[PDB]
């Protein structure tokens, strides 16, 4: 699933941001080389993205398909779909049989020069 | 149980943002804790990843169901497409 992948890649980017933050905090000021009013700017811009990423992630999780569905069901829906496939294909052969049967009919009259 | 897994996945995210907000100053947390925090903000992240991975099988079945369904619709499409033609022929022949 793509959504599941976007959720993985998203979580990946956030994990990195937490690291960039932890190490930026930790190393510079142990949270009490860069000036005070400076360490404050970045810290906010770094924690602002982390807040948005948390929203984004929660939305992806919400949009995951079959998120509120169990496994037992998924397996049923797959069996149900396979069965409908067999049927819809039986219908399709019939539809084609007939179309082809008709086309021959026309071809007949035409080659008959009529 | 992939549903319970989505539940805990949502709790961790909560407590993760909590711990961060404290660590980053927004919320209160006395200094000697600065460590417990950072440690938590790592255990939680690992737990999330692990939890997310365990969820893949579920999202794969979904990937299948989407295939199947796409097929099914495509087929029903072809059938419809043919019925149309028959009617169009019927027109050129009747009207």
Swiss-Prot record, chain A:
One Pfam family cited in the UniProt record for this chain: Med21
Record carries keyword rRNA-binding: no
One GO term describing the cellular component: mediator complex
Domain of life: Eukaryota
One function term, GO molecular function aspect: transcription coactivator activity
Biological process according to GO: negative regulation of transcription by RNA polymerase II; positive regulation of transcription by RNA polymerase II; positive regulation of transcription elongation by RNA polymerase II; positive regulation of transcription initiation by RNA polymerase II; regulation of transcription by RNA polymerase II; RNA polymerase II preinitiation complex assembly
Cellular compartments annotated: Nucleus
Protein family (similarity comment): Belongs to the Mediator complex subunit 21 family.
UniProt-recorded name of the protein: Mediator of RNA polymerase II transcription subunit 21
Lineage, top ranks: Eukaryota, Fungi, Dikarya, Ascomycota, Saccharomycotina
Designated gene of the protein: SRB7
Curated annotation (Swiss-Prot), chain B:
Additional remark text: Present with 7598 molecules/cell in log phase SD medium.
Subunit structure, interactors included: Component of the Mediator complex, which is composed of at least 21 subunits that form three structurally distinct submodules. The Mediator head module contains MED6, MED8, MED11, SRB4/MED17, SRB5/MED18, ROX3/MED19, SRB2/MED20 and SRB6/MED22, the middle module contains MED1, MED4, NUT1/MED5, MED7, CSE2/MED9, NUT2/MED10, SRB7/MED21 and SOH1/MED31, and the tail module contains MED2, PGD1/MED3, RGR1/MED14, GAL11/MED15 and SIN4/MED16. The head and the middle modules interact directly with RNA polymerase II, whereas the elongated tail module interacts with gene-specific regulatory proteins.
Functional note: Component of the Mediator complex, a coactivator involved in the regulated transcription of nearly all RNA polymerase II-dependent genes. Mediator functions as a bridge to convey information from gene-specific regulatory proteins to the basal RNA polymerase II transcription machinery. The Mediator complex, having a compact conformation in its free form, is recruited to promoters by direct interactions with regulatory proteins and serves for the assembly of a functional preinitiation complex with RNA polymerase II and the general transcription factors.
Compartment list: Nucleus
Record-stated family: Belongs to the Mediator complex subunit 7 family.
Gene: MED7
Protein name as it appears in the record: Mediator of RNA polymerase II transcription subunit 7
Domain of life the protein comes from: Eukaryota
Segment of the intact protein contained: 111 to 205 of 222
């Amino acid at each position: 699933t793509d959504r599941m992948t976007q959720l993985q890649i998203c979580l990946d980017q956030m994990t990195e941001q937490f690291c960039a933050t932890l190490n930026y905090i930790d190393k510079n000021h142990g949270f009490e080389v860069v000036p005070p009013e400076e360490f404050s700017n970045t810290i906010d811009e770094l924690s602002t993205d982390i807040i948005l990423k948390t929203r984004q992630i929660n939305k992806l999780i919400d949009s995951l398909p079959g998120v509120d569905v169990s496994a037992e069901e998924q397996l049923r829906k797959i069996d149900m779909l396979q069965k409908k496939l067999v049927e819809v294909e039986d219908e399709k052969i019939e539809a084609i049989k007939k179309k082809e049967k008709l086309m021959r009919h026309v071809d007949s009259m035409i080659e008959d020069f009529v | 149980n992939y549903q319970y897994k989505i539940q805990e996945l949502r709790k961790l995210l909560k407590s993760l943002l909590l711990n961060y907000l404290e660590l980053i100053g927004v919320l209160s947390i006395n200094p000697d804790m600065y460590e417990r925090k950072v440690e938590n903000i790592r255990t939680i992240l690992v737990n999330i990843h692990h939890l997310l991975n365990e969820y893949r099988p579920h999202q794969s079945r979904e990937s299948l169901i989407m295939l199947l369904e796409e097929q099914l619709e495509y087929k029903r499409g072809e059938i419809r497409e043919i019925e149309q033609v028959c009617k169009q022929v019927h027109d050129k022949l009747t009207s």
